[PDB]
Amino acid sequence: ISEFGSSRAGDGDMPAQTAPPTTANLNAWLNTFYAAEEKRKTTFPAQLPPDAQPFDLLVINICSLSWSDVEAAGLMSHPLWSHFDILFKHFNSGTSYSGPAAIRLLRASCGQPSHTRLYQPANNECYLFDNLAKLGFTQHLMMDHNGEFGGFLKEVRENGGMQSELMNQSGLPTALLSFDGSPVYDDLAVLNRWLTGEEREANSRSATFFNLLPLHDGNHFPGVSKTADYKIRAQKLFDELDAFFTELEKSGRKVMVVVVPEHGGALKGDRMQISGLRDIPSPSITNVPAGVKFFGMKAPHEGAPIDINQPSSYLAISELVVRAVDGKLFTEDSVNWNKLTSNLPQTAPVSENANAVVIQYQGKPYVRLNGGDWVPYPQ
Ligand SMILES: [Zn+2]
Numbered sequence: 270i271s272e273f274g275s276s277r278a279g280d281g282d283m284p285a286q287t288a289p290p291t292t293a294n295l296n297a298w299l300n301t302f303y304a305a306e307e308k309r310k311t312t313f314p315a316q317l318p319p320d321a322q323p324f325d326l327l328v329i330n331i332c333s334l335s336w337s338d339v340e341a342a343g344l345m346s347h348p349l350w351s352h353f354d355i356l357f358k359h360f361n362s363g364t365s366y367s368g369p370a371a372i373r374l375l376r377a378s379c380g381q382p383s384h385t386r387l388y389q390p391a392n393n394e395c396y397l398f399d400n401l402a403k404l405g406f407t408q409h410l411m412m413d414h415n416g417e418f419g420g421f422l423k424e425v426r427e428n429g430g431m432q433s434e435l436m437n438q439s440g441l442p443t444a445l446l447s448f449d450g451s452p453v454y455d456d457l458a459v460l461n462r463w464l465t466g467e468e469r470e471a472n473s474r475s476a477t478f479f480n481l482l483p484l485h486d487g488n489h490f491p492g493v494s495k496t497a498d499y500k501i502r503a504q505k506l507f508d509e510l511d512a513f514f515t516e517l518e519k520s521g522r523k524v525m526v527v528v529v530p531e532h533g534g535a536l537k538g539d540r541m542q543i544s545g546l547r548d549i550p551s552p553s554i555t556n557v558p559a560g561v562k563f564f565g566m567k568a569p570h571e572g573a574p575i576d577i578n579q580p581s582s583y584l585a586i587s588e589l590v591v592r593a594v595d596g597k598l599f600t601e602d603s604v605n606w607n608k609l610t611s612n613l614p615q616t617a618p619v620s621e622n623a624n625a626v627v628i629q630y631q632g633k634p635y636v637r638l639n640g641g642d643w644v645p646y647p648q
Pocket of ligand 1: 331332366367532
């Protein structure tokens with residue numbers, strides 16, 4: 270409402286940045302962001318209606334993949350991007366480390382917390398997979414790795430609340446040996462194992478968290494001395510995901526697939542951080558390609574993906590899940606794709622690790638180290 274407009278008797282997603290960019294103002298902005306975020310939640314229904322339609326949710330959480338990496342690797346034209354129904358162009362991962370990224374995603378149903386708030390119990394309604402479990406979705410955890418490095422699996426269980434056994438990995442082919450020497454299993458093989466298990470279950474409702482490590486630095490083909498080229502690994506991954514999307518189409522199963530990277534791999538370095546270093550969660554590291562694709566709809570989306578250009582993060586994924594949770598979009602004769610993709614929650618691109626916060630303020634990036642004075646991020 271403008272200065273001379275009025276509100277009605279009885280009457281923002283991102284706090285305003287009109288004040289000059291001093292340390293005090295940027296600190297105040299961040300505190301205002303934290304206050305606004307803490308009040309945000311995607312509300313799930315109390316129970317599903319009796320005419321709800323079962324479907325499977327599959328969340329594909331990929332280490333070390335940002336838009337900057339896709340650009341540096343020359344993979345912007347890979348067919349996979351064209352295959353989504355919904356594609357985010359300014360999705361912020363909120364961090365540049367794997368454990369906090371996975372916890373943030375598992376806590377997608379409430380607004381964005383500070384890094385310290387991630388390692389403390391949260392409200393039960395923040396846990397996307399718990400919200401689904403309550404509604405009758407069977408919970409599954411799978412990975413293409415053993416999760417031992419960095420205590421990743423322990424973080425996912427303890428802070429992400431994902432108290433589910435790791436899906437069986439016996440017999441899977443190894444695609445890479447990881448930077449810690451342990452296997453990275455082939456992703457198509459993991460996904461096909463999942464598809465056979467789900468198809469064993471009928472009109473079950475299930476929600477699966479799948480974490481993928483092939484793009485992590487230091488991974489190599491078995492027996493090969495050099496780290497496998499990132500472009501080669503990313504092409505392999507994207508070819509396998511696209512092959513799987515084809516398998517899912519053939520299955521006729523109702524499936525909502527969400528692809529959400531954890532953070533980038535810092536393929537292209539910058540002034541502050543040489544290639545591969547990502548201790549500061551810069552915009553280049555945290556702007557990640559997130560996408561959603563629905564399978565088995567009566568009325569599937571046609572043509573190119575719907576771009577979501579507004580600043581977004583995990584809360585927008587949770588909102589899409591609530592919009593789908595009764596399964597009815599899968600059986601509608603005609604879907605209002607505009608309405609389904611409109612009025613999604615917007616979230617300012619704030620990112621943190623324990624030691625650093627990065628924000629955009631009046632369109633420029635700043636970093637705060639250990640609660641000190643803000644300085645421009647040198648880009
Ligand atoms: Zn990672």
